[PDB]
Write a protein that binds this ligand. Structure first.
Ligand code: UDP
Ligand code: QUE
Length: 438
Protein backbone atom coordinates (compact mmCIF):
# COMPACT_ATOMS: atom_id res chain seq x y z
CA UNK A 1 0.00 0.00 0.00
CA UNK A 2 0.94 3.69 -0.03
CA UNK A 3 2.67 5.14 3.05
CA UNK A 4 1.22 5.21 6.56
CA UNK A 5 3.39 7.29 8.88
CA UNK A 6 2.96 6.75 12.64
CA UNK A 7 3.95 9.77 14.73
CA UNK A 8 4.63 9.28 18.46
CA UNK A 9 4.68 12.50 20.48
CA UNK A 10 6.14 13.10 23.94
CA UNK A 11 3.20 14.78 25.66
CA UNK A 12 5.15 16.97 28.14
CA UNK A 13 6.48 20.56 27.93
CA UNK A 14 6.64 21.89 24.34
CA UNK A 15 7.42 18.63 22.53
CA UNK A 16 4.17 17.74 20.78
CA UNK A 17 3.46 21.09 19.06
CA UNK A 18 6.72 21.38 17.02
CA UNK A 19 6.30 17.70 16.06
CA UNK A 20 2.78 18.46 14.76
CA UNK A 21 4.24 21.51 12.94
CA UNK A 22 6.63 19.28 10.93
CA UNK A 23 3.93 16.63 10.34
CA UNK A 24 1.75 19.39 8.79
CA UNK A 25 4.65 20.30 6.44
CA UNK A 26 5.32 16.62 5.67
CA UNK A 27 1.61 15.96 4.97
CA UNK A 28 1.51 18.82 2.43
CA UNK A 29 4.72 17.62 0.79
CA UNK A 30 3.67 13.96 0.68
CA UNK A 31 -0.10 14.12 -0.11
CA UNK A 32 -0.34 10.42 -1.01
CA UNK A 33 0.82 9.43 2.53
CA UNK A 34 -1.54 9.21 5.54
CA UNK A 35 -0.30 10.39 8.96
CA UNK A 36 -1.46 9.10 12.37
CA UNK A 37 -0.47 11.38 15.23
CA UNK A 38 -0.32 9.72 18.69
CA UNK A 39 -0.38 11.66 21.96
CA UNK A 40 -2.49 11.85 25.16
CA UNK A 41 -6.04 13.25 24.93
CA UNK A 42 -4.95 16.32 26.97
CA UNK A 43 -2.00 16.86 24.59
CA UNK A 44 -4.02 16.46 21.39
CA UNK A 45 -6.90 18.69 22.53
CA UNK A 46 -4.33 21.41 23.22
CA UNK A 47 -2.22 21.18 20.03
CA UNK A 48 -5.10 20.46 17.59
CA UNK A 49 -7.36 23.25 18.96
CA UNK A 50 -7.11 24.21 8.10
CA UNK A 51 -5.68 20.80 9.09
CA UNK A 52 -4.31 18.66 6.23
CA UNK A 53 -6.93 16.04 5.28
CA UNK A 54 -4.32 13.26 5.45
CA UNK A 55 -3.59 13.74 9.20
CA UNK A 56 -5.70 12.20 11.98
CA UNK A 57 -4.83 12.27 15.69
CA UNK A 58 -5.34 9.35 18.12
CA UNK A 59 -5.56 9.52 21.90
CA UNK A 60 -3.33 7.06 23.71
CA UNK A 61 -3.02 6.26 27.45
CA UNK A 62 -1.32 8.68 29.86
CA UNK A 63 -0.32 5.51 31.80
CA UNK A 64 -2.20 6.50 34.96
CA UNK A 65 -4.10 3.50 36.52
CA UNK A 66 -7.83 3.96 37.39
CA UNK A 67 -7.55 4.62 41.14
CA UNK A 68 -4.04 6.06 41.26
CA UNK A 69 -3.07 8.40 44.06
CA UNK A 70 -0.04 10.47 43.16
CA UNK A 71 2.95 10.33 45.51
CA UNK A 72 3.77 13.87 44.41
CA UNK A 73 7.32 13.14 43.18
CA UNK A 74 8.90 15.10 40.33
CA UNK A 75 8.69 13.34 36.94
CA UNK A 76 5.90 11.11 38.37
CA UNK A 77 3.63 11.89 35.40
CA UNK A 78 6.51 11.27 32.97
CA UNK A 79 7.37 7.97 34.68
CA UNK A 80 3.80 6.68 34.53
CA UNK A 81 3.45 7.73 30.89
CA UNK A 82 6.81 6.25 29.92
CA UNK A 83 6.34 2.78 31.52
CA UNK A 84 2.96 2.33 29.82
CA UNK A 85 4.01 3.97 26.51
CA UNK A 86 5.36 0.87 24.65
CA UNK A 87 1.94 -0.70 25.10
CA UNK A 88 -0.05 2.58 24.72
CA UNK A 89 1.57 3.47 21.39
CA UNK A 90 1.27 -0.13 20.07
CA UNK A 91 -2.48 -0.21 20.76
CA UNK A 92 -2.91 3.26 19.23
CA UNK A 93 -1.18 2.06 16.07
CA UNK A 94 -3.31 -1.11 15.98
CA UNK A 95 -6.31 1.23 15.85
CA UNK A 96 -4.85 3.48 13.11
CA UNK A 97 -3.95 0.49 10.94
CA UNK A 98 -7.48 -0.94 11.32
CA UNK A 99 -9.05 2.42 10.34
CA UNK A 100 -6.82 3.24 7.32
CA UNK A 101 -6.37 -0.33 6.04
CA UNK A 102 -2.64 0.48 5.72
CA UNK A 103 0.19 -1.12 7.71
CA UNK A 104 2.53 1.40 9.39
CA UNK A 105 5.32 2.06 6.84
CA UNK A 106 7.39 4.58 8.84
CA UNK A 107 7.83 5.46 12.49
CA UNK A 108 8.38 9.14 13.35
CA UNK A 109 8.80 9.81 17.08
CA UNK A 110 10.11 12.24 19.66
CA UNK A 111 13.70 11.15 20.39
CA UNK A 112 12.62 10.75 24.03
CA UNK A 113 10.55 7.67 22.96
CA UNK A 114 13.81 5.69 22.69
CA UNK A 115 12.05 2.29 22.50
CA UNK A 116 10.54 3.51 19.18
CA UNK A 117 13.78 2.09 17.72
CA UNK A 118 12.81 -1.36 18.99
CA UNK A 119 9.19 -0.90 17.81
CA UNK A 120 10.47 0.09 14.34
CA UNK A 121 12.82 -2.95 14.24
CA UNK A 122 9.94 -5.24 15.22
CA UNK A 123 7.62 -3.62 12.63
CA UNK A 124 10.25 -3.71 9.84
CA UNK A 125 10.06 0.06 9.26
CA UNK A 126 12.43 3.04 9.37
CA UNK A 127 12.82 4.94 12.60
CA UNK A 128 12.93 8.75 12.22
CA UNK A 129 13.43 10.42 15.57
CA UNK A 130 12.82 14.16 16.03
CA UNK A 131 15.15 15.91 18.46
CA UNK A 132 12.95 18.79 19.77
CA UNK A 133 15.80 20.85 21.19
CA UNK A 134 19.23 22.19 20.19
CA UNK A 135 22.17 20.42 18.56
CA UNK A 136 24.15 21.19 21.75
CA UNK A 137 21.94 18.95 23.89
CA UNK A 138 21.72 16.36 21.07
CA UNK A 139 25.51 16.15 21.16
CA UNK A 140 25.96 15.49 24.91
CA UNK A 141 23.37 12.68 24.84
CA UNK A 142 25.06 11.07 21.86
CA UNK A 143 28.36 11.39 23.79
CA UNK A 144 26.93 10.17 27.15
CA UNK A 145 29.28 7.18 27.60
CA UNK A 146 32.37 9.16 26.53
CA UNK A 147 31.46 12.09 28.83
CA UNK A 148 30.93 9.77 31.86
CA UNK A 149 34.29 8.09 31.13
CA UNK A 150 36.21 11.37 30.91
CA UNK A 151 34.57 13.09 33.91
CA UNK A 152 33.43 10.27 36.22
CA UNK A 153 30.04 9.64 37.84
CA UNK A 154 30.94 10.49 41.45
CA UNK A 155 30.47 14.28 41.22
CA UNK A 156 31.95 17.44 39.66
CA UNK A 157 32.57 19.40 42.91
CA UNK A 158 35.59 21.66 42.33
CA UNK A 159 35.38 21.11 38.56
CA UNK A 160 32.13 22.96 37.75
CA UNK A 161 33.75 25.52 35.46
CA UNK A 162 35.96 22.99 33.65
CA UNK A 163 35.47 22.84 29.89
CA UNK A 164 33.93 20.10 27.77
CA UNK A 165 36.46 20.97 25.05
CA UNK A 166 37.12 17.29 24.26
CA UNK A 167 33.78 17.38 22.35
CA UNK A 168 33.71 19.07 18.86
CA UNK A 169 31.50 22.18 18.68
CA UNK A 170 31.33 22.20 22.49
CA UNK A 171 34.54 24.08 23.40
CA UNK A 172 32.59 26.69 25.42
CA UNK A 173 30.39 24.43 27.57
CA UNK A 174 31.37 23.96 31.19
CA UNK A 175 30.82 20.81 33.29
CA UNK A 176 28.10 22.69 35.23
CA UNK A 177 26.13 23.37 31.97
CA UNK A 178 25.41 19.67 31.44
CA UNK A 179 21.85 18.40 31.83
CA UNK A 180 20.85 16.32 34.85
CA UNK A 181 21.47 12.62 34.15
CA UNK A 182 24.79 12.99 32.34
CA UNK A 183 27.26 13.26 35.23
CA UNK A 184 25.11 14.70 38.05
CA UNK A 185 21.60 14.55 39.47
CA UNK A 186 19.91 11.19 40.01
CA UNK A 187 21.70 8.88 37.57
CA UNK A 188 19.40 6.02 38.59
CA UNK A 189 16.05 7.67 37.83
CA UNK A 190 13.88 6.30 35.03
CA UNK A 191 14.33 9.64 33.20
CA UNK A 192 18.16 9.49 33.39
CA UNK A 193 18.17 5.88 32.16
CA UNK A 194 15.68 6.72 29.35
CA UNK A 195 18.03 9.50 28.16
CA UNK A 196 21.10 7.24 28.52
CA UNK A 197 19.50 4.57 26.31
CA UNK A 198 18.25 7.18 23.81
CA UNK A 199 21.85 8.42 23.51
CA UNK A 200 23.15 4.93 22.73
CA UNK A 201 20.49 4.09 20.17
CA UNK A 202 20.20 7.40 18.18
CA UNK A 203 23.24 6.45 16.04
CA UNK A 204 21.13 3.52 14.81
CA UNK A 205 18.30 5.74 13.49
CA UNK A 206 17.56 5.87 9.74
CA UNK A 207 17.69 9.64 10.23
CA UNK A 208 17.66 12.04 13.15
CA UNK A 209 16.05 15.41 12.36
CA UNK A 210 16.10 18.66 14.31
CA UNK A 211 14.49 22.17 14.39
CA UNK A 212 17.72 24.06 13.65
CA UNK A 213 19.98 25.03 10.71
CA UNK A 214 23.43 23.55 9.86
CA UNK A 215 25.20 26.93 9.74
CA UNK A 216 24.39 27.61 13.40
CA UNK A 217 27.61 25.72 14.07
CA UNK A 218 29.40 24.01 11.14
CA UNK A 219 31.72 21.94 13.36
CA UNK A 220 28.86 20.63 15.49
CA UNK A 221 26.87 19.89 12.35
CA UNK A 222 29.82 17.96 10.87
CA UNK A 223 30.53 16.14 14.12
CA UNK A 224 26.92 14.98 14.43
CA UNK A 225 26.80 13.84 10.79
CA UNK A 226 29.73 11.57 11.67
CA UNK A 227 28.04 10.12 14.79
CA UNK A 228 24.63 9.54 13.17
CA UNK A 229 23.64 7.73 9.96
CA UNK A 230 21.73 10.76 8.58
CA UNK A 231 21.36 14.07 10.39
CA UNK A 232 18.85 16.63 9.03
CA UNK A 233 18.52 20.26 10.19
CA UNK A 234 15.12 21.41 8.92
CA UNK A 235 14.51 24.67 10.80
CA UNK A 236 14.06 27.12 12.33
CA UNK A 237 10.36 26.16 12.00
CA UNK A 238 9.07 29.60 13.02
CA UNK A 239 10.88 31.26 10.09
CA UNK A 240 9.24 28.79 7.69
CA UNK A 241 5.75 29.12 9.21
CA UNK A 242 -5.42 42.26 24.24
CA UNK A 243 -1.60 42.07 24.46
CA UNK A 244 -0.92 43.40 20.94
CA UNK A 245 -3.37 46.30 21.35
CA UNK A 246 -1.59 47.17 24.62
CA UNK A 247 1.82 46.98 22.87
CA UNK A 248 0.53 49.28 20.09
CA UNK A 249 0.82 52.28 22.44
CA UNK A 250 4.33 51.63 23.79
CA UNK A 251 7.63 53.14 22.69
CA UNK A 252 9.88 51.07 20.42
CA UNK A 253 12.25 48.64 22.21
CA UNK A 254 10.93 49.62 25.66
CA UNK A 255 8.95 46.60 27.00
CA UNK A 256 10.33 43.64 28.97
CA UNK A 257 8.60 40.32 28.24
CA UNK A 258 8.94 37.58 30.89
CA UNK A 259 8.14 33.87 30.51
CA UNK A 260 9.48 30.52 31.71
CA UNK A 261 7.64 28.26 29.25
CA UNK A 262 5.23 25.46 30.17
CA UNK A 263 6.91 23.47 32.99
CA UNK A 264 9.08 25.97 34.86
CA UNK A 265 8.46 28.64 37.52
CA UNK A 266 11.11 30.50 39.51
CA UNK A 267 11.08 29.91 43.29
CA UNK A 268 8.93 32.43 45.30
CA UNK A 269 12.02 34.42 46.32
CA UNK A 270 12.96 35.02 42.67
CA UNK A 271 9.34 35.87 41.84
CA UNK A 272 9.71 38.58 44.55
CA UNK A 273 13.10 39.72 43.21
CA UNK A 274 11.77 40.13 39.65
CA UNK A 275 8.71 42.04 40.85
CA UNK A 276 11.05 44.39 42.79
CA UNK A 277 13.24 45.03 39.70
CA UNK A 278 10.17 45.73 37.55
CA UNK A 279 8.72 48.08 40.13
CA UNK A 280 11.96 49.91 41.00
CA UNK A 281 12.79 50.63 37.33
CA UNK A 282 9.13 51.24 36.33
CA UNK A 283 9.99 49.50 33.05
CA UNK A 284 6.96 48.60 30.89
CA UNK A 285 6.37 44.81 31.04
CA UNK A 286 4.35 41.74 30.17
CA UNK A 287 4.91 38.86 32.59
CA UNK A 288 3.49 35.45 31.62
CA UNK A 289 3.01 33.97 35.11
CA UNK A 290 0.88 30.99 36.31
CA UNK A 291 -2.28 32.18 38.07
CA UNK A 292 -1.40 29.87 40.96
CA UNK A 293 1.99 31.62 41.27
CA UNK A 294 0.33 35.03 41.73
CA UNK A 295 0.06 34.16 45.45
CA UNK A 296 3.87 34.63 45.58
CA UNK A 297 3.68 38.25 44.35
CA UNK A 298 4.45 40.89 47.03
CA UNK A 299 1.35 42.60 48.39
CA UNK A 300 0.72 45.77 46.39
CA UNK A 301 2.81 44.85 43.30
CA UNK A 302 -0.12 44.48 40.87
CA UNK A 303 -1.65 47.74 42.04
CA UNK A 304 1.64 49.67 41.86
CA UNK A 305 2.51 48.33 38.37
CA UNK A 306 -1.03 48.55 36.94
CA UNK A 307 -0.20 51.66 34.89
CA UNK A 308 2.73 50.17 33.02
CA UNK A 309 2.76 46.35 33.25
CA UNK A 310 0.60 43.24 32.74
CA UNK A 311 0.69 39.94 34.60
CA UNK A 312 -1.14 37.30 32.51
CA UNK A 313 -1.49 33.47 32.73
CA UNK A 314 -0.72 33.10 29.02
CA UNK A 315 0.52 35.47 26.32
CA UNK A 316 0.62 35.17 22.56
CA UNK A 317 4.40 34.83 22.94
CA UNK A 318 5.65 34.60 19.35
CA UNK A 319 3.65 37.72 18.31
CA UNK A 320 4.67 39.65 21.45
CA UNK A 321 8.34 38.95 20.72
CA UNK A 322 7.82 40.06 17.07
CA UNK A 323 6.31 43.40 18.18
CA UNK A 324 8.51 46.50 17.84
CA UNK A 325 7.62 47.64 21.41
CA UNK A 326 9.50 44.74 23.05
CA UNK A 327 13.16 45.29 23.95
CA UNK A 328 14.10 42.33 26.21
CA UNK A 329 13.06 38.75 27.02
CA UNK A 330 13.52 37.23 30.51
CA UNK A 331 13.51 33.51 29.69
CA UNK A 332 14.26 29.97 31.04
CA UNK A 333 16.27 29.40 27.79
CA UNK A 334 13.89 26.90 26.20
CA UNK A 335 14.70 26.13 22.54
CA UNK A 336 11.36 27.20 20.99
CA UNK A 337 11.36 30.48 22.99
CA UNK A 338 14.92 31.21 21.85
CA UNK A 339 14.07 30.99 18.14
CA UNK A 340 10.98 33.15 18.69
CA UNK A 341 13.20 35.82 20.29
CA UNK A 342 15.59 35.54 17.30
CA UNK A 343 12.64 35.99 14.87
CA UNK A 344 11.66 39.15 16.73
CA UNK A 345 15.24 40.39 17.19
CA UNK A 346 14.85 40.57 20.98
CA UNK A 347 17.90 40.07 23.27
CA UNK A 348 17.60 37.39 26.02
CA UNK A 349 18.01 37.57 29.79
CA UNK A 350 18.65 33.92 30.66
CA UNK A 351 17.72 32.16 33.90
CA UNK A 352 18.15 28.43 33.17
CA UNK A 353 16.83 25.77 35.63
CA UNK A 354 17.17 22.18 34.29
CA UNK A 355 17.30 19.92 31.20
CA UNK A 356 19.02 21.64 28.24
CA UNK A 357 18.36 25.14 29.62
CA UNK A 358 21.97 25.68 30.86
CA UNK A 359 23.38 24.55 27.53
CA UNK A 360 21.04 26.99 25.71
CA UNK A 361 22.00 29.80 28.13
CA UNK A 362 25.70 29.19 27.41
CA UNK A 363 24.99 29.26 23.64
CA UNK A 364 23.02 32.54 23.98
CA UNK A 365 25.63 34.31 26.18
CA UNK A 366 29.05 32.97 25.12
CA UNK A 367 28.52 31.50 21.65
CA UNK A 368 25.96 33.63 19.78
CA UNK A 369 26.24 36.73 22.00
CA UNK A 370 22.51 37.42 21.58
CA UNK A 371 21.75 37.67 25.30
CA UNK A 372 23.13 38.12 28.82
CA UNK A 373 23.39 36.17 32.10
CA UNK A 374 22.12 37.29 35.47
CA UNK A 375 25.06 37.67 37.87
CA UNK A 376 25.08 34.56 40.08
CA UNK A 377 22.50 32.60 38.09
CA UNK A 378 19.54 33.62 40.28
CA UNK A 379 17.17 36.58 40.12
CA UNK A 380 18.06 39.55 42.32
CA UNK A 381 16.51 43.07 42.20
CA UNK A 382 19.80 44.77 41.34
CA UNK A 383 21.07 42.04 38.96
CA UNK A 384 17.89 42.33 36.88
CA UNK A 385 17.82 46.15 36.95
CA UNK A 386 21.35 46.03 35.54
CA UNK A 387 20.36 43.62 32.72
CA UNK A 388 17.40 45.88 31.81
CA UNK A 389 19.69 48.95 31.69
CA UNK A 390 22.37 47.07 29.62
CA UNK A 391 19.82 45.96 27.01
CA UNK A 392 17.25 48.79 26.82
CA UNK A 393 19.42 51.84 27.36
CA UNK A 394 23.09 51.01 26.82
CA UNK A 395 25.54 50.09 24.08
CA UNK A 396 25.41 46.37 25.06
CA UNK A 397 21.79 46.13 23.78
CA UNK A 398 22.75 47.79 20.48
CA UNK A 399 25.38 45.10 19.94
CA UNK A 400 23.04 42.25 20.92
CA UNK A 401 20.42 43.48 18.46
CA UNK A 402 23.08 43.67 15.69
CA UNK A 403 24.11 40.12 16.52
CA UNK A 404 20.47 39.05 16.40
CA UNK A 405 19.90 40.68 12.98
CA UNK A 406 22.94 38.86 11.57
CA UNK A 407 21.95 35.51 13.10
CA UNK A 408 18.38 35.78 11.77
CA UNK A 409 19.62 36.57 8.24
CA UNK A 410 21.75 33.39 8.22
CA UNK A 411 18.74 31.47 9.55
CA UNK A 412 16.43 32.94 6.86
CA UNK A 413 18.83 31.86 4.15
CA UNK A 414 18.94 28.29 5.55
CA UNK A 415 15.14 28.07 4.99
CA UNK A 416 14.98 30.04 1.74
CA UNK A 417 15.21 28.59 -1.79
CA UNK A 418 18.39 26.46 -2.02
CA UNK A 419 18.82 26.83 1.77
CA UNK A 420 20.44 23.90 3.61
CA UNK A 421 17.23 23.31 5.67
CA UNK A 422 15.02 23.42 2.57
CA UNK A 423 17.27 20.75 1.01
CA UNK A 424 17.28 18.59 4.17
CA UNK A 425 13.49 18.70 4.28
CA UNK A 426 13.30 17.26 0.75
CA UNK A 427 15.50 14.41 2.02
CA UNK A 428 13.10 13.83 4.96
CA UNK A 429 10.04 14.00 2.71
CA UNK A 430 11.68 11.25 0.62
CA UNK A 431 12.23 9.13 3.74
CA UNK A 432 8.62 9.42 4.99
CA UNK A 433 7.27 8.88 1.43
CA UNK A 434 8.96 5.47 1.14
CA UNK A 435 6.43 2.66 1.34
CA UNK A 436 7.11 -0.30 3.65
CA UNK A 437 9.68 -2.88 2.47
CA UNK A 438 8.08 -6.04 1.01
O1 UDP B 1 2.75 32.55 27.91
C1 UDP B 1 3.27 31.78 27.11
C2 UDP B 1 4.35 30.97 27.48
C3 UDP B 1 4.91 30.11 26.53
N1 UDP B 1 4.38 30.07 25.26
C4 UDP B 1 4.94 29.18 24.23
O2 UDP B 1 5.38 27.95 24.78
C5 UDP B 1 6.55 27.50 24.12
C6 UDP B 1 7.64 27.31 25.17
O3 UDP B 1 8.55 26.37 24.67
P1 UDP B 1 10.08 26.25 25.15
O4 UDP B 1 10.84 25.24 24.37
O5 UDP B 1 10.67 27.59 25.02
O6 UDP B 1 10.06 25.86 26.72
P2 UDP B 1 9.24 24.64 27.39
O7 UDP B 1 7.86 25.07 27.60
O8 UDP B 1 9.28 23.45 26.51
O9 UDP B 1 9.91 24.33 28.68
C7 UDP B 1 6.93 28.57 23.10
O10 UDP B 1 6.48 28.20 21.82
C8 UDP B 1 6.18 29.80 23.58
O11 UDP B 1 5.87 30.69 22.53
C9 UDP B 1 3.31 30.88 24.91
O12 UDP B 1 2.84 30.86 23.76
N2 UDP B 1 2.76 31.74 25.84
O1 QUE C 1 10.10 18.25 28.93
C1 QUE C 1 11.33 18.04 29.48
C2 QUE C 1 12.50 18.04 28.73
O2 QUE C 1 12.40 18.24 27.38
C3 QUE C 1 13.73 17.84 29.38
C4 QUE C 1 15.04 17.76 28.64
C5 QUE C 1 15.24 18.37 27.40
C6 QUE C 1 16.46 18.25 26.73
C7 QUE C 1 17.48 17.50 27.31
O3 QUE C 1 18.67 17.37 26.68
C8 QUE C 1 17.30 16.88 28.54
O4 QUE C 1 18.32 16.15 29.08
C9 QUE C 1 16.07 17.00 29.20
O5 QUE C 1 13.76 17.64 30.64
C10 QUE C 1 12.73 17.64 31.37
C11 QUE C 1 12.87 17.44 32.75
C12 QUE C 1 11.74 17.44 33.56
O6 QUE C 1 11.91 17.24 34.90
C13 QUE C 1 10.47 17.65 33.03
C14 QUE C 1 10.31 17.86 31.66
O7 QUE C 1 9.06 18.05 31.12
C15 QUE C 1 11.44 17.84 30.84
Amino acid sequence: TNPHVAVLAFPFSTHAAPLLAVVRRLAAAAPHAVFSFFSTSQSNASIFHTMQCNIKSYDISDGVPEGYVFAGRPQEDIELFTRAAPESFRQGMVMAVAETGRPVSCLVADAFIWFAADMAAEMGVAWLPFWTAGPNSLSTHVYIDEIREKIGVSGIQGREDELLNFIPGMSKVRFRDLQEGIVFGNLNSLFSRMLHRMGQVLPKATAVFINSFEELDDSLTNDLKSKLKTYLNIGPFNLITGCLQWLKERKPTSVVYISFGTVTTPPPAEVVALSEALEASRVPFIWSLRDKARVHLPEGFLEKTRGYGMVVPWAPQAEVLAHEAVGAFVTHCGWNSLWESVAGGVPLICRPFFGDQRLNGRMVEDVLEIGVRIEGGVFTKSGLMSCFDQILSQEKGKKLRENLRALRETADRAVGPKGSSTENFITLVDLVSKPKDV
